[PDB]
Amino acid sequence: AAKPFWPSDDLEDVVVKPGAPVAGLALLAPDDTTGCLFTYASLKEHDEQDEEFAEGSTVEDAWLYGAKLNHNGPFAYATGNTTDIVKGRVLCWPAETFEDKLEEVYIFRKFDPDQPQEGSIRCSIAPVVLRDGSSTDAVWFHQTPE
């Protein structure tokens, strides 16, 4: 100890206290009451079929227009082509629960990328189209060939 590492600032300004604001993704607005995840192809194995992850959701079919698969790796990416369609499932949770689910799957997908060559794995919000033709905003994961 001694003189080294003794703070020249006020001790009160330097001692860390419980309850600081923690980092997070926080993808929802303060308005949003629901959050949804769009899953597809082999990603459904975890997102839909893992009982402890998918628990508490509502789930229905949905289509993502303008996206297509990478040739390797499990992810799609956005092309903007009207007839490129990724069919999948949208899982929805109350907003507070969704924030935890989204972080959990974000960590799960990005811990050990199978094909780091096909780009970086990210997620964003896109409208997905439900059976009745209505749309709902959902988070989806993608790996853009760049």
Side-chain angles (χ1 to χ4, degrees), residues 45-129:
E45 275 157 40
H46 167 268
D47 300 348
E48 189 191 11
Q49 296 294 331
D50 181 294
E51 174 187 357
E52 287 205 306
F53 176 74
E55 63 80 27
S57 63
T58 69
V59 61
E60 64 184 289
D61 290 349
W63 294 10
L64 174 63
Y65 287 82
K68 71 174 235 73
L69 259 298
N70 279 289
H71 299 81
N72 308 283
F75 297 99
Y77 65 93
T79 70
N81 196 306
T82 289
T83 62
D84 292 342
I85 300 168
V86 166
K87 307 173 189 187
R89 301 279 279 165
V90 57
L91 289 85
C92 297
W93 288 270
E96 289 196 4
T97 299
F98 174 73
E99 305 260 58
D100 297 319
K101 297 290 182 172
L102 176 57
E103 197 164 295
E104 170 175 357
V105 68
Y106 190 87
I107 293 161
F108 177 84
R109 293 296 175 202
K110 284 173 69 49
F111 178 71
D112 202 320
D114 306 316
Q115 307 283 316
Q117 48 274 40
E118 293 180 325
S120 83
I121 295 157
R122 305 297 203 212
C123 69
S124 57
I125 291 163
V128 294
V129 181

Side-chain angles (χ1 to χ4, degrees), residues 121-139:
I121 295 157
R122 305 297 203 212
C123 69
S124 57
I125 291 163
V128 294
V129 181
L130 310 182
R131 178 172 180 67
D132 62 16
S134 67
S135 70
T136 199
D137 286 349
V139 176

